[model samples]
Target: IPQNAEYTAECGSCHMAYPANLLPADKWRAITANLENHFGDNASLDPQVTARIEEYLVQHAAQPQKITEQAFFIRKHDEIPRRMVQDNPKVGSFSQCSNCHNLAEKGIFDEDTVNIPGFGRWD
Candidate 1:
């Protein structure tokens, strides 16, 4: 996952730091690789200081463009309605992996572990 100390500090400070394995190398690569103008709301960091983090991400990266976009994720949640995640007050968006996935931070996304807020457990 995005376990690097300073990397998530910079990336997660705004939104979720997001796990490295959640998305393939090219995705996160292009993300950190682009940090100028409209990027992370003008997120600017010393490349050298951030290089190690980027390298770490590249090592773990592997998946779809978005974690939810991943085929495995879609298949597991295919039965759920879009409104459940997009419209639920407790879950305003699918990007909120931690909300339902209690162990997401540790990179665990087992369906049995899923607990949709407001709606309760989902297999």
Candidate 2:
């Protein structure tokens, strides 16, 4: 996988340096365009940095089109019991891929490699 250096340093400051291939180029562009804002204050980088990372994400684009539009994520994860991610004592959400995916940082989140917290291998 082709990882972006600036993207990791910049985005990783807040959360994991997510794999850009998870969403299409357009979706990734939308995310970067508004990253300076959210539920609270501004969290995004300057225009220069934003542009750099956007190109990287666009180059490695995937589908799903939207991160939380859920259609894609829902289909991908519907098999997992809701309790495991939403009700389990150790995990209350499914936002962090690295929480269960050992190679998430490496952009390798194959089900066979998952090591969920408080649980074991997903495979």
Candidate 3:
């Protein structure tokens, strides 16, 4: 659960909607570092908006204060697995929630809706 979920109405105006928790600290760092060319497109965000999002992400992304067992996605992806030759590639990293979770945009990670192509249903 992240405060950014409340900002969805604003952030979603242009970018693909996603939960701040979907990506780990490292991944968020990578994405934010290249905001000018986010995922291959230019995402020249307003300074105010970027600052808010950055604050939200940094505060809630992943902190030691929160103690919870890691999700199956994280536990299962200790090592990158091979991608299925005939199907879409397997999720290469724990940061890639879009790999199986369909409602990732809505800040949801319902296991029931996970469909990882060759990986089939996720536990």
Candidate 4:
């Protein structure tokens, strides 16, 4: 899990606090600069808080604006059919990492630990 209290408290409230390493520093900078319309939501935050979050995210960031754009993410998800995630009622979509990643909160995404809801464990 993210050690930064501010980032976790603010970003994690609405959705899973995605590990910063999923994105790069540039993306984090843009994201933090435009929190007013975060993915079509008003996620504005105090400048100070935003700066702190940006710093943390940048420090630990990687590349690809969208997590799904990453090559590893694509490879990891290629085996599963869309129904198992996108069409499944329990899993709405891949955005909800916690639905399958048992240790997502700890930044652990090992395939052996995946447990898709209403579908049993995934290897």
Candidate 5:
């Protein structure tokens, strides 16, 4: 888990909940490394809180032991047929959580909110 104060004050201000575990170590590093230009905006952070969050993310972002056979989102997404409209190129990678995860801000990936364009319910 991220530092509660930093999580709530910094991340939660925009997103409902901070899903610190959703991103992998490399992605987290990439995002935090460029906080001043995060995505496209200046997402500044308290140095202490940033360190805590970075440590926490690294500790939890390991691949699931049981799902070792499965490919990570970046790799597995290649199998999706390009012709399928739902498999839009814009959100076709494992990092693209907004596609199937509707309430991603709340750290909720419930199937009820899944709206995969043409495919519909993904739960």
Candidate 6:
């Protein structure tokens, strides 16, 4: 579970309760501030709750850009061909961390914990 219960409860209700460390503080602020137009949905929340979640996310955010855009992320996933995730039916894209990282919901992203669909566990 995310370290913050409220965050997981509200954000996770729709999509993955993304790890705060995935994006920089400003990005979190931007996302939180615009929840009403969130990625194509009106994920509005109480003003106070919004502020609270934003604070928590900012506090633990990484010092970089979006997770998928970070250099570390690109380098780490480069070894795996794009076809594996893009073409595969069960795994849609890198955004679907849980499709391979089985314990993603619990905030555990260790490589040993991965289980890519149709390809079995990543060794």
What is the per-residue lDDT of model 6 for residues 14-87, given as tens digits with 9 covering 90 to 100?
76888888888998888888788876789899999998899999999886234677788898899887668989
Compose the digit string of candidate 2's lDDT tens values, residues 1-123: 335777788877766777877787877877778876642556677888788888888888785234535577778888889778988767677667778876777889788888878879888
Q: CA lDDT of each candidate?
A: 0.74, 0.75, 0.58, 0.83, 0.57, 0.82
TM per prediction:
0.78, 0.83, 0.52, 0.90, 0.52, 0.85
Which candidate has the top score in lDDT?
Answer: 4
lDDT of 1 at 99: 89
Task: Write model 4 residue lDDT over 1-123, tens digit each, in one string.
Answer: 536677878889888888888777897888788899887688899888888898999888884256766677889899899889888999988887988997786789888889999898886
Candidate 1 local lDDT, 1-123, one digit each (tens): 524766667777666667787777887767667565423377657878568767888987874145677787788778889778778988887876888888776678788889998988886
lDDT of 1: 0.74
**At residue 88, what lDDT does model 4 achieve?**
96
Candidate 5 residue pairs that clash? none
Q: Name the lDDT value of residue 99 in candidate 3.
A: 59
**Candidate 4 Cα misplacement greater than 4 A, ranges:** 1-3
Model 1 TM-score on a 0 to 1 scale: 0.78
Give lDDT for model 3. Answer: 0.58
lDDT of 4 at 56: 90
- Model 3 ranges off by over 4 Å: 5-16, 24-27, 64-99, 106-112, 116-123
**Cα RMSD to the true fold for all candidates:** 3.1, 2.7, 6.5, 2.1, 6.2, 2.4
lDDT of 5 by residue, 1-123 (tens): 534555656755543444666556776677666677755567778888777766766666644111112355436446546544345654554344555567765667665776665566755
* Candidate 2 accuracy as TM-score: 0.83
The order by descending lDDT is 4, 6, 2, 1, 3, 5
